[PDB]
Amino acid sequence: SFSGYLKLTDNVYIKNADIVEEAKKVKPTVVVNAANVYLKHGGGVAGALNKATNNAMQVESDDYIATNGPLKVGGSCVLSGHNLAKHCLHVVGPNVNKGEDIQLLKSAYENFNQHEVLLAPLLSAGIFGADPIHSLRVCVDTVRTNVYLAVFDKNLYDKLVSSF
C-alpha cells in the first residue's frame, strides 16, 4: 500500500512525490486527476498522467466528452485508471488563472468523499493558480475519506508541512 506519507489528520496524508511514479508503484483503486472541464490533459498533473498512459487517457476522455459534454467546474467523472490505477477520478478544481470562483474548490474536494481511499494532487494548485496552502486547508476541512496527497515540488511540500 502507501508508504512514506506524513499523517496530517485522521484521514489526510501527504508525501513529496511525483503522482505518476506514486500511481505506478501503488496502483491505487483511485488516482485523482487535476482535470479541466474539457478533459484536455495538456499540462501539469493531467498532462503527466495522460503521458504515462501513452495518451490512452486522452482518447478515452475525448470519447467521454463527445458523449456527455464538458464537466462543471467543481465536478468530476470516473474513468479508467489505465496502467496507473483501477480508476481515475477526473476532478475539476477552479482555475484562478481563468477567473473561476475559488469557493468552487470545496465542491471539487467533495467529489473525493465518494471514494474510500484516493491518491491525489492538491486541487487548483500548480498551473491552476490557487494558493496550495489554501487548497490543503480546504482538503482537510472537506474530505472525510482517506486521501494520500502527492506534492511534486519539494520546496512546496516543506512549506505545506511547516505551515499546517
UniProtKB/Swiss-Prot annotation:
Coiled coil ranges: none
Residues of the full protein shown: 1027 to 1190 of 7096
Regulation of catalytic or functional activity: Inhibited in vitro by GRL-0617.
Classification lineage: Viruses, Riboviria, Orthornavirae, Pisuviricota, Pisoniviricetes
Assembly notes: May form homohexamers. Interacts with N protein.
Localization (cell): Host endoplasmic reticulum membrane
Tree of life domain: Viruses
Bilayer disposition of the protein: Multi-pass membrane protein
Ranges where the Macro domain occurs: 1-164
Role this protein plays: Responsible for the cleavages located at the N-terminus of the replicase polyprotein. Participates together with nsp4 in the assembly of virally-induced cytoplasmic double-membrane vesicles necessary for viral replication. Antagonizes innate immune induction of type I interferon by blocking the phosphorylation, dimerization and subsequent nuclear translocation of host IRF3. Also prevents host NF-kappa-B signaling. In addition, PL-PRO possesses a deubiquitinating/deISGylating activity and processes both 'Lys-48'- and 'Lys-63'-linked polyubiquitin chains from cellular substrates.
Reactions mediated catalytically: Thiol-dependent hydrolysis of ester, thioester, amide, peptide and isopeptide bonds formed by the C-terminal Gly of ubiquitin (a 76-residue protein attached to proteins as an intracellular targeting signal)
Native source species: Severe acute respiratory syndrome coronavirus 2 (2019-nCoV)
Protein's recorded name: Papain-like protease nsp3
